Amino acid sequence: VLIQFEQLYRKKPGLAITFAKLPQNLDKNRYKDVLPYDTTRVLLQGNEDYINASYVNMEIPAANLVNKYIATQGPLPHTCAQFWQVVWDQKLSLIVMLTTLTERGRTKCHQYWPDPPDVMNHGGFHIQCQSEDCTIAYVSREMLVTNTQTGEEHTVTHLQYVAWPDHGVPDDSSDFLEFVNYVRSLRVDSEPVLVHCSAGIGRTGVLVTMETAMCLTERNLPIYPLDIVRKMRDQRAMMVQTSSQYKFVCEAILRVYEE
């Protein structure tokens, strides 16, 4: 289990990564080594089409189910406009953020939403935070996004998980599992859920894996985490980054089963 994960490829052989490496796009990547594949990267309309974001879709035909995601990095100060453009273009209603802005004195994410009652403007979108409600492990916010060119409004639910430790992984998986079940509760139809952490591969991969395992468990279907991970990595490289993360995922999967 914890040995074949380490043997598994990080990037799918043959899959080109070219746009992410273009000189004009380099400072739009948070981490120089975490890049979207050309084939699954999200495209922006405009003269510069690039964001470090990937479409990641998890098919479970044995449940007549497809769970769509957009996996992305924490936006940078100069990529917030693009982040909100993706949210707008895809009319996404749920953003899941798996980090605090800083962890052990290191920046992980730019604050791309306002603290109420402030507002922000990014790429011609006005953002207002209508509500902010905390639980022990996470914060739920309702965002009103206004396209300043058209006056059109869109409501977006923003979930931020704040309890992940600055080192390693949660000692007790309960709160994270509750969070994933809340995310599942808000998922719509075949509408992607935007998920990000700092690079959009580690905690993001853990989340996608656990939602997938929960869907499988619910319909009494077999769960092979190494398959689930490979499937994600064919769509965004390096997802589920560390053995500690993979080990965490596995034990959690056995908990939900046994509980």
Side-chain angles (χ1 to χ4, degrees), residues 128-168:
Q128 307 180 69
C129 179
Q130 303 299 67
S131 68
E132 182 167 86
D133 290 293
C134 302
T135 72
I136 295 179
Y138 59 90
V139 187
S140 188
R141 305 174 172 96
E142 294 302 323
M143 322 234 53
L144 197 290
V145 183
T146 300
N147 184 334
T148 59
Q149 283 208 54
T150 63
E152 191 179 350
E153 290 171 1
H154 172 62
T155 41
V156 180
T157 296
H158 185 262
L159 297 187
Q160 184 191 11
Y161 197 81
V162 299
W164 194 286
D166 281 359
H167 297 273

mmCIF file of all heavy atoms in Angstrom, residues 128-168:
data_model
loop_
_atom_site.group_PDB
_atom_site.id
_atom_site.type_symbol
_atom_site.label_atom_id
_atom_site.label_comp_id
_atom_site.label_asym_id
_atom_site.label_seq_id
_atom_site.Cartn_x
_atom_site.Cartn_y
_atom_site.Cartn_z
ATOM 1 N N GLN A 128 -18.299 40.788 -2.633
ATOM 2 C CA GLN A 128 -18.797 41.181 -1.325
ATOM 3 C C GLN A 128 -19.032 39.908 -0.534
ATOM 4 O O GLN A 128 -19.494 38.919 -1.085
ATOM 5 C CB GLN A 128 -20.122 41.918 -1.470
ATOM 6 C CG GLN A 128 -20.080 43.072 -2.430
ATOM 7 C CD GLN A 128 -21.418 43.751 -2.516
ATOM 8 O OE1 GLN A 128 -21.846 44.391 -1.560
ATOM 9 N NE2 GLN A 128 -22.106 43.595 -3.644
ATOM 10 N N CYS A 129 -18.712 39.921 0.753
ATOM 11 C CA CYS A 129 -18.959 38.769 1.596
ATOM 12 C C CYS A 129 -20.212 39.045 2.375
ATOM 13 O O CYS A 129 -20.210 39.933 3.178
ATOM 14 C CB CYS A 129 -17.801 38.577 2.556
ATOM 15 S SG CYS A 129 -18.027 37.193 3.675
ATOM 16 N N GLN A 130 -21.258 38.270 2.111
ATOM 17 C CA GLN A 130 -22.569 38.458 2.694
ATOM 18 C C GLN A 130 -22.702 37.873 4.094
ATOM 19 O O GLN A 130 -23.489 38.371 4.910
ATOM 20 C CB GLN A 130 -23.613 37.790 1.802
ATOM 21 C CG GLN A 130 -23.634 38.292 0.353
ATOM 22 C CD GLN A 130 -23.948 39.777 0.251
ATOM 23 O OE1 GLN A 130 -23.152 40.626 0.673
ATOM 24 N NE2 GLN A 130 -25.105 40.100 -0.325
ATOM 25 N N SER A 131 -21.976 36.787 4.357
ATOM 26 C CA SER A 131 -22.052 36.129 5.643
ATOM 27 C C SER A 131 -20.799 35.328 5.857
ATOM 28 O O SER A 131 -20.142 34.905 4.906
ATOM 29 C CB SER A 131 -23.278 35.207 5.729
ATOM 30 O OG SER A 131 -23.120 34.087 4.850
ATOM 31 N N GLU A 132 -20.508 35.108 7.132
ATOM 32 C CA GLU A 132 -19.311 34.415 7.538
ATOM 33 C C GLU A 132 -19.696 33.692 8.831
ATOM 34 O O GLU A 132 -20.186 34.331 9.779
ATOM 35 C CB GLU A 132 -18.206 35.447 7.734
ATOM 36 C CG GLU A 132 -16.866 34.898 8.112
ATOM 37 C CD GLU A 132 -15.744 35.947 7.972
ATOM 38 O OE1 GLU A 132 -15.522 36.724 8.924
ATOM 39 O OE2 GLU A 132 -15.077 35.996 6.908
ATOM 40 N N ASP A 133 -19.591 32.362 8.825
ATOM 41 C CA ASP A 133 -20.013 31.508 9.949
ATOM 42 C C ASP A 133 -18.942 30.488 10.218
ATOM 43 O O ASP A 133 -18.514 29.808 9.299
ATOM 44 C CB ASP A 133 -21.297 30.770 9.609
ATOM 45 C CG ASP A 133 -22.501 31.699 9.548
ATOM 46 O OD1 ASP A 133 -22.912 32.249 10.600
ATOM 47 O OD2 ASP A 133 -23.049 31.877 8.447
ATOM 48 N N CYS A 134 -18.504 30.394 11.457
ATOM 49 C CA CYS A 134 -17.423 29.465 11.814
ATOM 50 C C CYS A 134 -17.934 28.224 12.549
ATOM 51 O O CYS A 134 -18.903 28.265 13.339
ATOM 52 C CB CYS A 134 -16.427 30.158 12.738
ATOM 53 S SG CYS A 134 -15.682 31.653 12.058
ATOM 54 N N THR A 135 -17.244 27.129 12.301
ATOM 55 C CA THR A 135 -17.324 25.936 13.092
ATOM 56 C C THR A 135 -15.920 25.785 13.659
ATOM 57 O O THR A 135 -15.062 26.636 13.436
ATOM 58 C CB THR A 135 -17.727 24.728 12.233
ATOM 59 O OG1 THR A 135 -16.635 24.348 11.378
ATOM 60 C CG2 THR A 135 -18.937 25.074 11.376
ATOM 61 N N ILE A 136 -15.695 24.702 14.392
ATOM 62 C CA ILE A 136 -14.407 24.395 14.961
ATOM 63 C C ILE A 136 -13.288 24.365 13.892
ATOM 64 O O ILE A 136 -12.223 24.969 14.074
ATOM 65 C CB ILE A 136 -14.462 23.013 15.675
ATOM 66 C CG1 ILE A 136 -15.424 23.094 16.865
ATOM 67 C CG2 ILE A 136 -13.082 22.579 16.119
ATOM 68 C CD1 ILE A 136 -15.585 21.809 17.650
ATOM 69 N N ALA A 137 -13.549 23.651 12.802
ATOM 70 C CA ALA A 137 -12.494 23.299 11.837
ATOM 71 C C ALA A 137 -12.573 24.072 10.531
ATOM 72 O O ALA A 137 -11.649 24.022 9.698
ATOM 73 C CB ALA A 137 -12.547 21.824 11.552
ATOM 74 N N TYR A 138 -13.665 24.794 10.296
ATOM 75 C CA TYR A 138 -13.807 25.479 9.028
ATOM 76 C C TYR A 138 -14.692 26.722 9.117
ATOM 77 O O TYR A 138 -15.383 26.938 10.113
ATOM 78 C CB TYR A 138 -14.280 24.514 7.923
ATOM 79 C CG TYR A 138 -15.603 23.839 8.175
ATOM 80 C CD1 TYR A 138 -16.779 24.416 7.747
ATOM 81 C CD2 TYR A 138 -15.654 22.600 8.791
ATOM 82 C CE1 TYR A 138 -18.017 23.780 7.987
ATOM 83 C CE2 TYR A 138 -16.869 21.956 9.012
ATOM 84 C CZ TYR A 138 -18.024 22.547 8.593
ATOM 85 O OH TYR A 138 -19.231 21.908 8.828
ATOM 86 N N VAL A 139 -14.635 27.522 8.057
ATOM 87 C CA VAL A 139 -15.418 28.732 7.926
ATOM 88 C C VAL A 139 -16.236 28.618 6.654
ATOM 89 O O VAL A 139 -15.723 28.196 5.608
ATOM 90 C CB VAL A 139 -14.533 29.987 7.840
ATOM 91 C CG1 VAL A 139 -15.434 31.246 7.880
ATOM 92 C CG2 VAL A 139 -13.508 30.000 8.958
ATOM 93 N N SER A 140 -17.496 28.999 6.736
ATOM 94 C CA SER A 140 -18.396 29.053 5.602
ATOM 95 C C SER A 140 -18.786 30.506 5.346
ATOM 96 O O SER A 140 -19.293 31.204 6.237
ATOM 97 C CB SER A 140 -19.631 28.196 5.867
ATOM 98 O OG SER A 140 -20.438 28.081 4.707
ATOM 99 N N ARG A 141 -18.585 30.953 4.111
ATOM 100 C CA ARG A 141 -18.899 32.331 3.699
ATOM 101 C C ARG A 141 -19.762 32.319 2.446
ATOM 102 O O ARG A 141 -19.591 31.456 1.579
ATOM 103 C CB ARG A 141 -17.625 33.112 3.395
ATOM 104 C CG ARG A 141 -16.593 33.151 4.509
ATOM 105 C CD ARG A 141 -15.331 33.835 4.039
ATOM 106 N NE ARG A 141 -14.349 34.095 5.093
ATOM 107 C CZ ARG A 141 -13.311 33.297 5.377
ATOM 108 N NH1 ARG A 141 -13.147 32.170 4.741
ATOM 109 N NH2 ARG A 141 -12.438 33.626 6.305
ATOM 110 N N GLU A 142 -20.691 33.267 2.366
ATOM 111 C CA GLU A 142 -21.478 33.449 1.166
ATOM 112 C C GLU A 142 -20.920 34.679 0.477
ATOM 113 O O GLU A 142 -20.849 35.745 1.093
ATOM 114 C CB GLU A 142 -22.947 33.645 1.504
ATOM 115 C CG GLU A 142 -23.602 32.413 2.121
ATOM 116 C CD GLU A 142 -23.521 31.167 1.234
ATOM 117 O OE1 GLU A 142 -23.636 31.308 -0.003
ATOM 118 O OE2 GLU A 142 -23.368 30.046 1.783
ATOM 119 N N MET A 143 -20.508 34.506 -0.781
ATOM 120 C CA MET A 143 -19.929 35.573 -1.585
ATOM 121 C C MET A 143 -20.928 36.010 -2.648
ATOM 122 O O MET A 143 -21.538 35.156 -3.285
ATOM 123 C CB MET A 143 -18.667 35.075 -2.282
ATOM 124 C CG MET A 143 -17.819 34.128 -1.426
ATOM 125 S SD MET A 143 -16.123 34.682 -1.281
ATOM 126 C CE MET A 143 -16.498 36.358 -0.715
ATOM 127 N N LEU A 144 -21.069 37.322 -2.823
ATOM 128 C CA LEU A 144 -21.807 37.882 -3.946
ATOM 129 C C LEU A 144 -20.791 38.425 -4.948
ATOM 130 O O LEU A 144 -20.007 39.321 -4.619
ATOM 131 C CB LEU A 144 -22.750 38.983 -3.457
ATOM 132 C CG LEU A 144 -23.897 39.440 -4.368
ATOM 133 C CD1 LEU A 144 -23.372 40.194 -5.564
ATOM 134 C CD2 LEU A 144 -24.770 38.273 -4.809
ATOM 135 N N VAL A 145 -20.790 37.862 -6.155
ATOM 136 C CA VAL A 145 -19.867 38.277 -7.215
ATOM 137 C C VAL A 145 -20.676 39.036 -8.254
ATOM 138 O O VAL A 145 -21.701 38.534 -8.742
ATOM 139 C CB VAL A 145 -19.176 37.058 -7.886
ATOM 140 C CG1 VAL A 145 -18.184 37.496 -8.918
ATOM 141 C CG2 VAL A 145 -18.514 36.141 -6.817
ATOM 142 N N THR A 146 -20.226 40.245 -8.600
ATOM 143 C CA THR A 146 -20.949 41.092 -9.561
ATOM 144 C C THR A 146 -20.007 41.368 -10.729
ATOM 145 O O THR A 146 -18.884 41.819 -10.550
ATOM 146 C CB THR A 146 -21.421 42.417 -8.944
ATOM 147 O OG1 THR A 146 -22.314 42.163 -7.838
ATOM 148 C CG2 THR A 146 -22.151 43.244 -9.987
ATOM 149 N N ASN A 147 -20.483 41.088 -11.934
ATOM 150 C CA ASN A 147 -19.752 41.419 -13.147
ATOM 151 C C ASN A 147 -20.043 42.912 -13.423
ATOM 152 O O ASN A 147 -21.147 43.274 -13.788
ATOM 153 C CB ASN A 147 -20.265 40.544 -14.285
ATOM 154 C CG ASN A 147 -19.507 40.757 -15.563
ATOM 155 O OD1 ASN A 147 -18.951 41.825 -15.784
ATOM 156 N ND2 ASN A 147 -19.463 39.735 -16.405
ATOM 157 N N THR A 148 -19.024 43.764 -13.272
ATOM 158 C CA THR A 148 -19.204 45.197 -13.389
ATOM 159 C C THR A 148 -19.506 45.636 -14.836
ATOM 160 O O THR A 148 -19.952 46.754 -15.047
ATOM 161 C CB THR A 148 -18.004 46.018 -12.827
ATOM 162 O OG1 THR A 148 -16.803 45.671 -13.529
ATOM 163 C CG2 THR A 148 -17.812 45.742 -11.333
ATOM 164 N N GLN A 149 -19.269 44.772 -15.821
ATOM 165 C CA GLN A 149 -19.623 45.121 -17.200
ATOM 166 C C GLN A 149 -21.101 44.914 -17.477
ATOM 167 O O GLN A 149 -21.676 45.654 -18.270
ATOM 168 C CB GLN A 149 -18.785 44.353 -18.220
ATOM 169 C CG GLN A 149 -17.374 44.905 -18.367
ATOM 170 C CD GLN A 149 -16.776 44.665 -19.739
ATOM 171 O OE1 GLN A 149 -17.367 45.014 -20.759
ATOM 172 N NE2 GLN A 149 -15.574 44.099 -19.768
ATOM 173 N N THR A 150 -21.700 43.918 -16.822
ATOM 174 C CA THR A 150 -23.085 43.530 -17.125
ATOM 175 C C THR A 150 -24.063 43.712 -15.975
ATOM 176 O O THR A 150 -25.269 43.650 -16.210
ATOM 177 C CB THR A 150 -23.178 42.041 -17.536
ATOM 178 O OG1 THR A 150 -22.775 41.220 -16.441
ATOM 179 C CG2 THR A 150 -22.331 41.713 -18.746
ATOM 180 N N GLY A 151 -23.585 43.928 -14.752
ATOM 181 C CA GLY A 151 -24.466 44.010 -13.575
ATOM 182 C C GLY A 151 -24.932 42.655 -13.065
ATOM 183 O O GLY A 151 -25.634 42.570 -12.044
ATOM 184 N N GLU A 152 -24.570 41.590 -13.774
ATOM 185 C CA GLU A 152 -25.043 40.267 -13.415
ATOM 186 C C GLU A 152 -24.423 39.892 -12.093
ATOM 187 O O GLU A 152 -23.241 40.160 -11.879
ATOM 188 C CB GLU A 152 -24.656 39.227 -14.463
ATOM 189 C CG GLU A 152 -25.381 37.880 -14.235
ATOM 190 C CD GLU A 152 -25.059 36.794 -15.265
ATOM 191 O OE1 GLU A 152 -24.422 37.099 -16.295
ATOM 192 O OE2 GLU A 152 -25.465 35.629 -15.020
ATOM 193 N N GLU A 153 -25.207 39.232 -11.250
ATOM 194 C CA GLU A 153 -24.738 38.725 -9.957
ATOM 195 C C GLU A 153 -24.755 37.197 -9.898
ATOM 196 O O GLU A 153 -25.637 36.543 -10.466
ATOM 197 C CB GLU A 153 -25.647 39.229 -8.847
ATOM 198 C CG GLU A 153 -25.542 40.720 -8.552
ATOM 199 C CD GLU A 153 -26.624 41.219 -7.575
ATOM 200 O OE1 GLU A 153 -27.450 40.404 -7.096
ATOM 201 O OE2 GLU A 153 -26.645 42.430 -7.283
ATOM 202 N N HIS A 154 -23.809 36.636 -9.146
ATOM 203 C CA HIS A 154 -23.701 35.192 -8.967
ATOM 204 C C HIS A 154 -23.335 34.979 -7.495
ATOM 205 O O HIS A 154 -22.514 35.729 -6.953
ATOM 206 C CB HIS A 154 -22.653 34.637 -9.945
ATOM 207 C CG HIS A 154 -22.314 33.192 -9.743
ATOM 208 N ND1 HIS A 154 -23.240 32.178 -9.873
ATOM 209 C CD2 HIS A 154 -21.137 32.591 -9.446
ATOM 210 C CE1 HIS A 154 -22.652 31.017 -9.633
ATOM 211 N NE2 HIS A 154 -21.374 31.240 -9.378
ATOM 212 N N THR A 155 -23.978 34.016 -6.828
ATOM 213 C CA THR A 155 -23.680 33.708 -5.430
ATOM 214 C C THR A 155 -22.766 32.492 -5.387
ATOM 215 O O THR A 155 -23.000 31.516 -6.105
ATOM 216 C CB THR A 155 -24.961 33.416 -4.643
ATOM 217 O OG1 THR A 155 -25.833 32.612 -5.449
ATOM 218 C CG2 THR A 155 -25.681 34.719 -4.256
ATOM 219 N N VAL A 156 -21.711 32.577 -4.577
ATOM 220 C CA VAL A 156 -20.732 31.533 -4.443
ATOM 221 C C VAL A 156 -20.524 31.254 -2.953
ATOM 222 O O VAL A 156 -20.351 32.194 -2.165
ATOM 223 C CB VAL A 156 -19.398 31.992 -5.073
ATOM 224 C CG1 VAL A 156 -18.365 30.895 -4.940
ATOM 225 C CG2 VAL A 156 -19.607 32.364 -6.538
ATOM 226 N N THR A 157 -20.602 29.976 -2.583
ATOM 227 C CA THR A 157 -20.301 29.498 -1.245
ATOM 228 C C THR A 157 -18.811 29.176 -1.194
ATOM 229 O O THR A 157 -18.285 28.490 -2.068
ATOM 230 C CB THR A 157 -21.107 28.241 -0.924
ATOM 231 O OG1 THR A 157 -22.503 28.578 -0.917
ATOM 232 C CG2 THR A 157 -20.726 27.629 0.431
ATOM 233 N N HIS A 158 -18.149 29.732 -0.189
ATOM 234 C CA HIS A 158 -16.708 29.595 0.016
ATOM 235 C C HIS A 158 -16.504 28.837 1.326
ATOM 236 O O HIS A 158 -17.005 29.266 2.367
ATOM 237 C CB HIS A 158 -16.091 30.970 0.120
ATOM 238 C CG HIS A 158 -14.596 30.959 0.210
ATOM 239 N ND1 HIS A 158 -13.924 31.063 1.403
ATOM 240 C CD2 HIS A 158 -13.657 30.955 -0.765
ATOM 241 C CE1 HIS A 158 -12.622 31.057 1.164
ATOM 242 N NE2 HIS A 158 -12.434 30.982 -0.141
ATOM 243 N N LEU A 159 -15.867 27.670 1.266
ATOM 244 C CA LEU A 159 -15.574 26.894 2.454
ATOM 245 C C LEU A 159 -14.102 26.891 2.676
ATOM 246 O O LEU A 159 -13.373 26.534 1.771
ATOM 247 C CB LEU A 159 -16.021 25.453 2.291
ATOM 248 C CG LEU A 159 -17.517 25.214 2.096
ATOM 249 C CD1 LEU A 159 -17.786 23.718 2.127
ATOM 250 C CD2 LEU A 159 -18.352 25.929 3.132
ATOM 251 N N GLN A 160 -13.661 27.319 3.839
ATOM 252 C CA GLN A 160 -12.233 27.307 4.136
ATOM 253 C C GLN A 160 -11.941 26.419 5.318
ATOM 254 O O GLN A 160 -12.475 26.649 6.394
ATOM 255 C CB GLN A 160 -11.772 28.712 4.454
ATOM 256 C CG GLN A 160 -10.274 28.818 4.687
ATOM 257 C CD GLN A 160 -9.838 30.137 5.247
ATOM 258 O OE1 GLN A 160 -10.652 30.940 5.660
ATOM 259 N NE2 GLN A 160 -8.525 30.352 5.318
ATOM 260 N N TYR A 161 -11.138 25.393 5.104
ATOM 261 C CA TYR A 161 -10.737 24.478 6.155
ATOM 262 C C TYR A 161 -9.532 25.095 6.857
ATOM 263 O O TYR A 161 -8.524 25.364 6.199
ATOM 264 C CB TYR A 161 -10.357 23.096 5.603
ATOM 265 C CG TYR A 161 -10.344 22.041 6.679
ATOM 266 C CD1 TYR A 161 -11.498 21.442 7.117
ATOM 267 C CD2 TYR A 161 -9.156 21.657 7.288
ATOM 268 C CE1 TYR A 161 -11.493 20.493 8.058
ATOM 269 C CE2 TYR A 161 -9.145 20.730 8.289
ATOM 270 C CZ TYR A 161 -10.325 20.144 8.695
ATOM 271 O OH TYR A 161 -10.315 19.188 9.693
ATOM 272 N N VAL A 162 -9.619 25.317 8.165
ATOM 273 C CA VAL A 162 -8.568 26.034 8.909
ATOM 274 C C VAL A 162 -7.782 25.171 9.899
ATOM 275 O O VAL A 162 -6.809 25.649 10.498
ATOM 276 C CB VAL A 162 -9.124 27.279 9.649
ATOM 277 C CG1 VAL A 162 -9.695 28.221 8.678
ATOM 278 C CG2 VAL A 162 -10.162 26.896 10.664
ATOM 279 N N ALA A 163 -8.242 23.937 10.108
ATOM 280 C CA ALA A 163 -7.689 23.084 11.149
ATOM 281 C C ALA A 163 -6.571 22.133 10.705
ATOM 282 O O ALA A 163 -6.067 21.369 11.541
ATOM 283 C CB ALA A 163 -8.805 22.314 11.801
ATOM 284 N N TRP A 164 -6.138 22.182 9.447
ATOM 285 C CA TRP A 164 -5.077 21.248 9.025
ATOM 286 C C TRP A 164 -3.756 21.700 9.671
ATOM 287 O O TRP A 164 -3.409 22.879 9.613
ATOM 288 C CB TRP A 164 -4.929 21.225 7.497
ATOM 289 C CG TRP A 164 -4.123 20.101 6.954
ATOM 290 C CD1 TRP A 164 -2.767 19.974 7.006
ATOM 291 C CD2 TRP A 164 -4.610 18.923 6.273
ATOM 292 N NE1 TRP A 164 -2.382 18.795 6.398
ATOM 293 C CE2 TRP A 164 -3.487 18.140 5.936
ATOM 294 C CE3 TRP A 164 -5.884 18.467 5.908
ATOM 295 C CZ2 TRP A 164 -3.595 16.917 5.273
ATOM 296 C CZ3 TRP A 164 -5.987 17.242 5.252
ATOM 297 C CH2 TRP A 164 -4.843 16.492 4.934
ATOM 298 N N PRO A 165 -3.008 20.760 10.269
ATOM 299 C CA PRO A 165 -1.827 21.185 11.009
ATOM 300 C C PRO A 165 -0.723 21.735 10.113
ATOM 301 O O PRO A 165 -0.650 21.412 8.938
ATOM 302 C CB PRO A 165 -1.384 19.901 11.731
ATOM 303 C CG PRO A 165 -1.891 18.800 10.928
ATOM 304 C CD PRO A 165 -3.201 19.301 10.336
ATOM 305 N N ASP A 166 0.136 22.586 10.668
ATOM 306 C CA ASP A 166 1.166 23.209 9.849
ATOM 307 C C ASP A 166 2.227 22.180 9.420
ATOM 308 O O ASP A 166 2.892 22.384 8.416
ATOM 309 C CB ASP A 166 1.796 24.398 10.564
ATOM 310 C CG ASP A 166 0.910 25.668 10.497
ATOM 311 O OD1 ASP A 166 -0.201 25.657 9.890
ATOM 312 O OD2 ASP A 166 1.350 26.700 11.040
ATOM 313 N N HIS A 167 2.353 21.090 10.178
ATOM 314 C CA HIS A 167 3.188 19.945 9.804
ATOM 315 C C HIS A 167 2.373 18.676 9.771
ATOM 316 O O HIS A 167 1.503 18.471 10.611
ATOM 317 C CB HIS A 167 4.292 19.754 10.823
ATOM 318 C CG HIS A 167 5.239 20.896 10.910
ATOM 319 N ND1 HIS A 167 6.343 21.008 10.095
ATOM 320 C CD2 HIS A 167 5.233 21.999 11.694
ATOM 321 C CE1 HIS A 167 6.992 22.118 10.392
ATOM 322 N NE2 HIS A 167 6.343 22.734 11.364
ATOM 323 N N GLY A 168 2.691 17.799 8.827
ATOM 324 C CA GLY A 168 2.026 16.506 8.741
ATOM 325 C C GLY A 168 0.541 16.651 8.446
ATOM 326 O O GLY A 168 0.137 17.530 7.705
#
